[PDB]
Design an enzyme around this catalytic site. Sequence first.
Site, PDB file in Angstrom:
ATOM      1  N   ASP A 187       1.679  95.375  14.204  1.00 41.93           N
ATOM      2  CA  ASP A 187       2.899  96.049  14.624  1.00 41.93           C
ATOM      3  C   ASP A 187       4.108  95.506  13.873  1.00 41.93           C
ATOM      4  OD1 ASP A 187       2.390  93.664  15.790  1.00 41.93           O
ATOM      5  OD2 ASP A 187       3.243  94.167  17.751  1.00 41.93           O
ATOM      6  N   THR A 243       7.661 101.192  16.546  1.00 37.32           N
ATOM      7  CA  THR A 243       8.486 100.303  15.732  1.00 37.32           C
ATOM      8  C   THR A 243       8.421 100.678  14.255  1.00 37.32           C
ATOM      9  OG1 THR A 243       8.342  98.443  17.270  1.00 37.32           O
ATOM     10  CG2 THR A 243       8.747  97.945  14.952  1.00 37.32           C
ATOM     11  N   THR A 244       7.207 100.797  13.714  1.00 37.28           N
ATOM     12  CA  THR A 244       7.060 101.121  12.300  1.00 37.28           C
ATOM     13  C   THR A 244       7.616 102.506  11.996  1.00 37.28           C
ATOM     14  OG1 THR A 244       5.127  99.681  12.115  1.00 37.28           O
ATOM     15  CG2 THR A 244       5.426 101.353  10.421  1.00 37.28           C
ATOM     16  N   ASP A 265       1.259  97.074  24.480  1.00 38.20           N
ATOM     17  CA  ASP A 265       1.637  98.376  23.937  1.00 38.20           C
ATOM     18  C   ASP A 265       1.034  99.510  24.761  1.00 38.20           C
ATOM     19  OD1 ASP A 265       3.185  97.474  21.623  1.00 38.20           O
ATOM     20  OD2 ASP A 265       1.270  96.801  20.795  1.00 38.20           O
TER      21      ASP A 265
HETATM   22  N1  LIG Z   1      -6.456 109.468  14.004  1.00 32.33           N
HETATM   23  C1  LIG Z   1      -5.198 109.703  13.561  1.00 32.33           C
HETATM   24  N2  LIG Z   1      -4.978 110.544  12.532  1.00 32.33           N
HETATM   25  C2  LIG Z   1      -3.739 110.785  12.075  1.00 32.33           C
HETATM   26  N3  LIG Z   1      -2.627 110.237  12.582  1.00 32.33           N
HETATM   27  C3  LIG Z   1      -2.701 109.377  13.618  1.00 32.33           C
HETATM   28  C4  LIG Z   1      -4.019 109.051  14.177  1.00 32.33           C
HETATM   29  N4  LIG Z   1      -3.799 108.182  15.180  1.00 32.33           N
HETATM   30  C5  LIG Z   1      -2.460 107.969  15.251  1.00 32.33           C
HETATM   31  N5  LIG Z   1      -1.809 108.683  14.319  1.00 32.33           N
HETATM   32  C6  LIG Z   1      -0.346 108.698  14.095  1.00 32.33           C
HETATM   33  O1  LIG Z   1       0.053 107.393  13.679  1.00 32.33           O
HETATM   34  C7  LIG Z   1       1.173 106.935  14.430  1.00 32.33           C
HETATM   35  C8  LIG Z   1       0.806 105.615  15.084  1.00 32.33           C
HETATM   36  O2  LIG Z   1       1.208 104.548  14.242  1.00 32.33           O
HETATM   37  P1  LIG Z   1       1.565 103.137  14.912  1.00 32.33           P
HETATM   38  O3  LIG Z   1       0.919 102.031  14.113  1.00 32.33           O
HETATM   39  O4  LIG Z   1       1.341 103.262  16.398  1.00 32.33           O
HETATM   40  O5  LIG Z   1       3.149 103.122  14.658  1.00 32.33           O
HETATM   41  P2  LIG Z   1       4.110 102.069  15.394  1.00 32.33           P
HETATM   42  O6  LIG Z   1       3.624 100.727  14.914  1.00 32.33           O
HETATM   43  O7  LIG Z   1       5.478 102.458  14.896  1.00 32.33           O
HETATM   44  O8  LIG Z   1       3.885 102.322  16.862  1.00 32.33           O
HETATM   45  C9  LIG Z   1       1.486 107.983  15.482  1.00 32.33           C
HETATM   46  O9  LIG Z   1       2.748 108.586  15.193  1.00 32.33           O
HETATM   47  C10 LIG Z   1       0.399 109.025  15.373  1.00 32.33           C
HETATM   48  O10 LIG Z   1       1.007 110.309  15.266  1.00 32.33           O
END
Ligand SMILES: Nc1ncnc2c1ncn2[C@@H]1O[C@H](COP(=O)(O)OP(=O)(O)O)[C@@H](O)[C@H]1O
Lengths: 189, 524, 525, 529
Positions: free
Chosen positions: B57, B90-91, B388
């Site tokens: 994260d 966050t990302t 989370d």
């Molecule tokens: N299997 C998947 N295929 C495509 N996109 C995905 C999948 N799973 C999650 N996502 C996308 O990736 C993002 C999740 O990234 P994440 O690492 O949770 O970001 P952050 O660290 O900002 O929370 C979400 O916006 C979601 O739409």
Amino acid sequence: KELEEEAEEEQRILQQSVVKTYEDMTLEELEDHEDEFNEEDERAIEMYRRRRLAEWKATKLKNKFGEVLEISGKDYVQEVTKAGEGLWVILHLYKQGIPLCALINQHLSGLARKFPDVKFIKAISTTCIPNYPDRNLPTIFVYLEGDIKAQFIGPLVFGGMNLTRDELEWKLSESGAIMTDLEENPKKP
Amino acid sequence: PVLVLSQNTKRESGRKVQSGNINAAKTIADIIRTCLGPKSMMKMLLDPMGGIVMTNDGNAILREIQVQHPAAKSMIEISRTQDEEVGDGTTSVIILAGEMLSVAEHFLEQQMHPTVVISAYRKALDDMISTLKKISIPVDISDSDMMLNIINSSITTKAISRWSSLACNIALDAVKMVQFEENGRKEIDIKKYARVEKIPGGIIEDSCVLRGVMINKDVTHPRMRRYIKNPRIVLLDSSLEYKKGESQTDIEITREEDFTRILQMEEEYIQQLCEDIIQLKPDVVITEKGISDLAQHYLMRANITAIRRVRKTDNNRIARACGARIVSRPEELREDDVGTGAGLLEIKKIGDEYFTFITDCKDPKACTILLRGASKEILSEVERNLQDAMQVCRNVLLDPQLVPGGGASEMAVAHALTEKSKAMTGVEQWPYRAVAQALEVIPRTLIQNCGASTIRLLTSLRAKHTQENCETWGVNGETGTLVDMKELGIWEPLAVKLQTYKTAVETAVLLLRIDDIVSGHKKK
Amino acid sequence: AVKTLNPKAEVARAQAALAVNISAARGLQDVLRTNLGPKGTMKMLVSGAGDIKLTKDGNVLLHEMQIQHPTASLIAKVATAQDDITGDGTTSNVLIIGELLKQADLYISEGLHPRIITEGFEAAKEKALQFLEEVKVSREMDRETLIDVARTSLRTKVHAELADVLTEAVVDSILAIKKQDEPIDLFMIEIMEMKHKSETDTSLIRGLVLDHGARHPDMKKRVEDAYILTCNVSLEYEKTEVNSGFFYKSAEEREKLVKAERKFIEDRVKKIIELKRKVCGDSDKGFVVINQKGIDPFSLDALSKEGIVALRRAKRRNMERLTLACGGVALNSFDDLSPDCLGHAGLVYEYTLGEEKFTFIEKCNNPRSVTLLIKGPNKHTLTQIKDAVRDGLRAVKNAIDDGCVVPGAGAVEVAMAEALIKHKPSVKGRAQLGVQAFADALLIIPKVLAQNSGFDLQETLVKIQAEHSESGQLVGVDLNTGEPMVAAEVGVWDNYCVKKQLLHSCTVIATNILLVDEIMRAGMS
Amino acid sequence: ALHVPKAPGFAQMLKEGAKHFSGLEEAVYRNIQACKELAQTTRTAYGPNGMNKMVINHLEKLFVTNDAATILRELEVQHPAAKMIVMASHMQEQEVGDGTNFVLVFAGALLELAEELLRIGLSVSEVIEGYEIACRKAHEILPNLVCCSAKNLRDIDEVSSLLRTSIMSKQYGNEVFLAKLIAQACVSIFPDSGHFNVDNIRVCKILGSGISSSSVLHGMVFKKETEGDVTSVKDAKIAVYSCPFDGMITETKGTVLIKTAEELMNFSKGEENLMDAQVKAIADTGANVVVTGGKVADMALHYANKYNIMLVRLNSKWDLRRLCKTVGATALPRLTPPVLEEMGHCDSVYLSEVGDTQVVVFKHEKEDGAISTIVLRGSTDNLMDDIERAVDDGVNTFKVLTRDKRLVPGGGATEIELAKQITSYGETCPGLEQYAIKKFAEAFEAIPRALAENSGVKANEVISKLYAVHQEGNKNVGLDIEAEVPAVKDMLEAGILDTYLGKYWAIKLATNAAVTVLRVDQIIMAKPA
Ligand SMILES: Nc1ncnc2c1ncn2[C@@H]1O[C@H](COP(=O)(O)OP(=O)(O)O)[C@@H](O)[C@H]1O
Ligand SMILES: Nc1ncnc2c1ncn2[C@@H]1O[C@H](COP(=O)(O)OP(=O)(O)O)[C@@H](O)[C@H]1O
Ligand SMILES: Nc1ncnc2c1ncn2[C@@H]1O[C@H](COP(=O)(O)OP(=O)(O)O)[C@@H](O)[C@H]1O
Ligand SMILES: [Mg+2]
Ligand SMILES: [Mg+2]
Ligand SMILES: [Mg+2]
């Protein structure tokens, strides 16, 4: 206040200075924690406890004064010279001049109460020293055994009316008196 | 010599500093661009204190980074803001802010004043919030299947994804066990009453949330029973030994029968306090302070298990679980303050430590997660992912809305406000479309992370995402393909997405309104 | 790209991070692989002060290595957690980490991504768990099997004769357990140290050994038939809590006041004296008082004039151990002294060693807490024996907890690697190649057994899979000859929970390391 | 190409001051070399012709002596293997009291021969197992080598003869005198119950005349002076107190209250009268000597002089308990004039000067007592220290003689016979381990040779003569001292013997140390701070 968890407590103890390192407590908090200490070194902690108890009883044995005793020129020689081995005095020479004598008189009682380990004596300038100049209204002539150890004669040396409760502790201790539980040279301001 | 300002004061002004600010954000957006998506890559951080943080994260990455550039300091504060407010995205928000500044720099160079760019950014933010609320779909709270699906969507991009079918359940249980009704109104969901505790060594799927409370304490005396079937727990805040008090007493003794009488008075005071505790018939007594030897003796003679000093938070969660109440003066220990409902109290041994469980309690309002893994860092990452998931579950229980994931919602809102901007006229339309294609980075980031070519894939996505209510179409990052998110089944709370967009646009405004820097001087 | 923001920052990017992690793991594996098995070689370790530590444990050596590498610390705390919970299997843990990492880098340097390698690792871990569950043998844990398991562990730790005597002592110690359904508590089996006669003189004492002795010179040094009074009251002078003070007017008043101040503890000790005289003063039946808190010399003399022996300042655990062994009851106050509060001992005596005194309590009717007396000529021998007996005790307790034990000598590793190879065609993807790596990774367990014995790795291994032909038993490596040897018949056993913990933790940590693409150091200033 | 980089792996992740030695030639050979150096730094101090050595400790204190344990302890050693050998020798000294130089020589010889074998091509395990087999064989055959078991342990002459051979290893000249005094001191403490203690033989060091002026007295001597004015009580009853000779005070702080002038008058008079009554109560019981463990009040001292009470202060709990043991009294915490069963009885108490050292003497004149004291004279502190070390070694020899009274011939006889037996066993044994067995015969050669090495004769010649004579079977012949030519003579008749238990423990500990140091093959030193 204490609404903080194990991780927060560790963060606080690391941030404060470094750590308490389970070796620098008094009979209060090493007794109250009583459970964080690991059990494989019971002999070491118990030996430390016995040595600290011996230190506490030794300190309480020599803490016998408690409050300032005021004397005249008659016995002044005995309480300036024959006060005892390993003991030093204060010898506050004071008059009925309001400001500095009054403030120092009120503060020395508290200091003697919180330091029952060191002799506090106060004398009036007229009948302790023959014809004292009396312009230098404060006079704390600290005697280590019977010789000079420090001297404060002028109100400018103390700083005038702006005297707090505990900076007198540092002022007396800088000459080599009993240690202080307080930091900073001029007690902040 | 002769000076006006301080000797050490430095000043910077003009487009130069503006560029620097933008660049700073981009650099912060460049460190953790590879951590976004289900195909993310772990990063190892070396603490100044000797520890190691092995995490994915963004917030856990930035909190260990110190930057002397104040724009990067603002970006780190934004990351912490997003972590604290919602617990997710966050990302996404950091990348969005970085690309919004990167695209505003182009207009800054073309002799355009930042104020019109800020106005266009605010208009774009309002419109994207509107059209993001437009495409949302409701979620059935009572349906546990959809709750597990949402937590799976929130957990599929972390290190514990392989145990998702377990982890989701854990989170759900905890979030559905803290849910409480306060005095009248004010429903609450607080994570002070949901403790996660790490016990290194063991099996990851052996971890489970206990129907009660676990603390790392031991029974005060060996003879006291370590297995209580149906405890009646009384919680104590004060101490159970003899204390001097507050005023200075200095008792004076002149007779032969006062010293021993004083000591017997202390003993009888302890006896009276313990009898006051005993008379209401408890079975387990929990105290935040010490226990005298006489105190534990008298309690033991009544067959009571005494647990010595317990941290105040643990006592609070124990009270919330068992339904008991903390009393400081034992003589006022009422019947209603006695905790009944604890289904079992057990003093177990784990590794080489004693752990006390008050599990099996009826309808608890506090939980403890026995999180057993392989290492301290592994468990730390697991509990971060659990936090989370808990935050996402709370967000969706407090907000019954949902929005497509995988960059589908971002592309949808981008196209919607692009079509909105195609009608208006003026100089602010160009920054409007700049923001429109700025929300496009995260789908591109996913396509780049999965290893596929972003040009043709994203071109096809944007082209097909224009007609016939395809706003739910996004990218599958596991196979790097274009899918309809309904079949893939990944949805995210609307709160997380809207908060991400708001925070990114506001950070862009903050770092875009600035044109002068004065560095180096006394605090005040 | 943080060097732009933090000029004094250390960054290792994707290929750099992989290379540095694999190199560190290879270094740790190469250091730790020279001791695995009973054929390993000791290591002498010197700290700053100059004390000598002779060890063969993976965890002890790994902690006392002078290393600073981050991933080295990661695997170090993985190993110490595994040691803490399971008891042993630490060197093999490090070797397995090194081999997973080496094979993964071998298959990645060929132009591959670690994701498919980790997917193959997960599939192989599932298959390995199934095979390990289906290969374990469940029996009734009796004397012979426990001797076998403890002998394996102690033969690993130390040499033959000392290993066998320690095995007998360890089993006899952890066999006096409570009800079968009640989980074992290992605090009761306590370890005592004595810089004393030869290392083969370490043994098991049924009662307890206490590092404290009778502080009064006139107390008897040996009592045959002893009552025991374990207490937690303070016969030490306890002053008034609230800052009291005596005030008198003459020396006679001073004497009366000193008598009055002694009166309280005098009464408290008189309670003990009355209890002893009421229970039995007859036929030289001795009385022992064991107190956790201090005892003042006034009370020492008062008790000594009655023919009593009193022990002061004992450990907290010793009260529980004594009430479990002697059979009495712990006391926190003398409000209700009863004859049922005294435990029974058939011999309580005192032994001197230089200046130290030890009190031995033994000849109990049926001890529930025993003690292991370790005797040695020098300190490092005592520490080595202590770690060896710890490993043996945890191994025996692990065997007792779940009635299943796995064949040792790397036989199970070879069999489960063969099963993984057979299952490899059924992974449905590229990840199957990663599974292959996983299989070869497990072969680091038997291979080193050959390498430490002086045999070539390849030929003896190929012999092992040759013996794992249609004659499909659980056959491992014989450290005396190298010919394949059936582990079950000889009795080289191993703990099933240890293997399970290895298969879980090693896979988890290797997977997490292979997913690391950047090592970062910033935030210092 | 001007700098060889660090090898990737462990060598690149080491700490700054850490040193890693791995492999046979880089660790085992270095350990062997260091242990050989440690053995040869003391080999010259072996036997009745061993020269004393002077050591300046880290505090600049002179120690001149040939006791191996003392020079080994007061000489800083930093090598690990040498520390191992130091620990083994010190454990040998603690267990028996002799054999520490034997342990050094034997361990060095074993390690040197093990290095030779490892060079030849034997494995580490082969040498270790051969050493263990040979050690077990030596322990199995040792009891058959004993002769002339100690008979009485009460006759003065016999015990003096038995201890004289344990004394000759230090101060080869003045041997019979020291043995006579040690025997006289030791027999008077043997409590005819079998439990003979070594802490009841104290040594009092008085500067002055030569050694021949030393003496033993069945009491104690304290370097103190009486606090009173009466000295030399004839036949005293001694009272022993563990509390200061003062009016006992409250443990809790107590301040006296005076509210009327009458109390201020009577306070001092009443305190004085109370103290006088207490002193009179103590004195009327026939007590003549009062000894206290704390400070003595001036008024109490006055009332001690008035009733003619000797008053001797003591400032050590050990001294107090030892005085209680030697006089038969027990320390009591209050004044409380003692009852008849706890009044020490001593034949006389003196305050005497011998070497300008005023001392207090509690001499008995009936040989009875549980403690006897050696007052040994000398001209230098260091020489008296060496004599005290010799007395300690003789006392420990007597202690190890109380149990397992068996004796073995000395002067190299036992070592050579044991070597011959063990090499016969090795030659009558197959396998690859036999080589190690054949090395013990060489290791036991290190001991007699050292003796010859210190006597100014040829070690090879005396070894050849020893084997030549022992081939006949007279197992009781060994090296002759001061013959100006390598020669041999009987040891059963010469009285040169050693305790069987001492040699047993020495061999066992030397073999244990050598095997343990041989076992390790990897060293990781960590930044000497
Ligand atoms: N299997 C998947 N295929 C495509 N996109 C995905 C999948 N799973 C999650 N996502 C996308 O990736 C993002 C999740 O990234 P994440 O690492 O949770 O970001 P952050 O660290 O900002 O929370 C979400 O916006 C979601 O739409
Ligand atoms: N007598 C024996 N013969 C052959 N193999 C053995 C024998 N004893 C133990 N082993 C094997 O050698 C290995 C020793 O592992 P060990 O050194 O105890 O690992 P760790 O140090 O990590 O606990 C075990 O896996 C066991 O199967
Ligand atoms: N008169 C003598 N003639 C020949 N040998 C002797 C004589 N007296 C003693 N020895 C030998 O000298 C050796 C002295 O060894 P010693 O220095 O006491 O060893 P350690 O210091 O280890 O006790 C003894 O082994 C003894 O056999
Ligand atoms: Mg997320
Ligand atoms: Mg093992
Ligand atoms: Mg000697």
